[PDB]
Design a protein around this ligand. Sequence first.
Ligand SMILES: Nc1ccn([C@@H]2O[C@H](COP(=O)(O)OP(=O)(O)OP(=O)(O)O)[C@@H](O)[C@H]2O)c(=O)n1
Length: 573
Amino acid sequence: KMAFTLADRVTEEMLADKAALVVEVVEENYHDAPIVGIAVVNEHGRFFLRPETALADPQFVAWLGDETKKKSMFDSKRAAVALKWKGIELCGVSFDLLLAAYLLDPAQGVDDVAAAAKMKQYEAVRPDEAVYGKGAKRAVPDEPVLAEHLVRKAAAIWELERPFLDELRRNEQDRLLVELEQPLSSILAEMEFAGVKVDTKRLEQMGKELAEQLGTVEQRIYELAGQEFNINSPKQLGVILFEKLQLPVLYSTSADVLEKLAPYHEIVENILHYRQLGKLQSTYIEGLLKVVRPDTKKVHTIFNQALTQTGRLSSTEPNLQNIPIRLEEGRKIRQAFVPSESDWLIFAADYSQIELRVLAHIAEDDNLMEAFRRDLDIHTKTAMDIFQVSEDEVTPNMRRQAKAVNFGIVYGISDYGLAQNLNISRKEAAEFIERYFESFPGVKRYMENIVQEAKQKGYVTTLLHRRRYLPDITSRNFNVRSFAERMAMNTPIQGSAADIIKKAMIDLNARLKEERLQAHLLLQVHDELILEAPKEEMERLCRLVPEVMEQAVTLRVPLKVDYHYGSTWYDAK
DNA sequence: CGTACGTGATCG
Ligand SMILES: Nc1ccn([C@@H]2O[C@H](COP(=O)(O)OP(=O)(O)OP(=O)(O)O)[C@@H](O)[C@H]2O)c(=O)n1
């Protein structure tokens, strides 16, 4: 057993100017969720507090909100947001063990204190899953069990801060934690708590029309197949296509396959159309409506800041980072995302080709840097170079194929992978790649060098010193090793872009505050920032937002930001 | 050829 005081009231010694603090929210989605318990560990001892008591105590609430009273936590954003829903401000979080663990090694998948602790041979704390259970059997245990668990977590955080900070310093990542990820955590908390207003009537109207079109195409499919079957079943669909109708096998029924089969039978295009409507209906209408809060008609995503292996955020419940845009039918979903106040507008700013600009910078490729210095259309320029033609001679198919090469280069180029993407032979794809590297020899040297460096050091890094370990780079299995080489090529690009936009968000918020604008961030989608603001602020934002985003870092090429605003997210185009 | 998440089907 670990010793602690199970307090009935808050005392002064619990309010020291440095503590490990646990404000426990067990529900996965912490929005408007209960706080089940509080633990504090500091120089004076270890304390468990009941939240109905602590959170009603003015001295404790003042302590929580006092920036000069420093707290060490794990996933402080969870606590901060749960407290925001209770009208309580959390300040002074100086160390977040989740973010520290994430920066040291995102591959550990650390999502509880016990997992972080094990990184430093500290095992005197249980995994959350062992305490709460998983799935439907999940539950908050009785007080003695709960209290001991929260105290052990606080004690672990209290013990682990120094070793974690020491290692971050050794890796030259301590500023990344303290000046980037931790401040960003607070900004993410604000964005999540603000939420995004949804026009549910509009979504419901779209739902109704979709359902009608769905019925129509569904019956057309049955008529064409000469029978009814579950179109969403791969088994049944595969039978209909490849046995009853005898279509060729190029069973995979992925979209790319169906697109190749479309010429053989009228049913195929109907099946694609059906899947597409069904996607919109199930995921982007019905699924979105399920998570809208009925009182305020807002969705409050959770941005997972300690999940991706490259330093990107992810977004859940709902995922607001994969709302359709490419095809008009799906893009209309965005008409349902609206400003939260009357006479406000949505303002969206996106980096133009940030990944290829970062590549130009890190590779110091003269041709690619010159292309961005001239603000050329990069896909047209790449086509000119690889196909050896003048700008006026670049055909649409050529630009399309060059664009695909540009994607492959950023992802970690593969002849089989590019070949798959363009529906061409491996030798054909290999020729394109060779021509690319002939035109961009700095990029080739960079790709060769970064793989060698990954092998030598064991990891790759981003501009702001994020790291990703790549143990498979030495595998004697070709496929395993090749995937690791692709990660070595891609991670510094994708990850540096993530560093840049994170810093831009911090810089933007500081400027917004200085200027006392009411404008605020709502979402980030990897290389874009979505805000809402009074209509009277648009002219100022048109100058401020792109400037801050462009100046977040200084590269060997310019950063370029495009922007638009409108009455809904759809119209901010 | 990179990084995510949600869904419906499947399947233990
Ligand atoms: N102790 C440190 C040093 C650097 N960085 C990160 O790395 C970035 C660039 O570091 P910087 O020192 O300014 O440039 P370099 O000289 O290239 O790096 P180094 O420390 O090796 O000299 C910083 O902005 C920061 O994000 C950090 O997180 N912690």
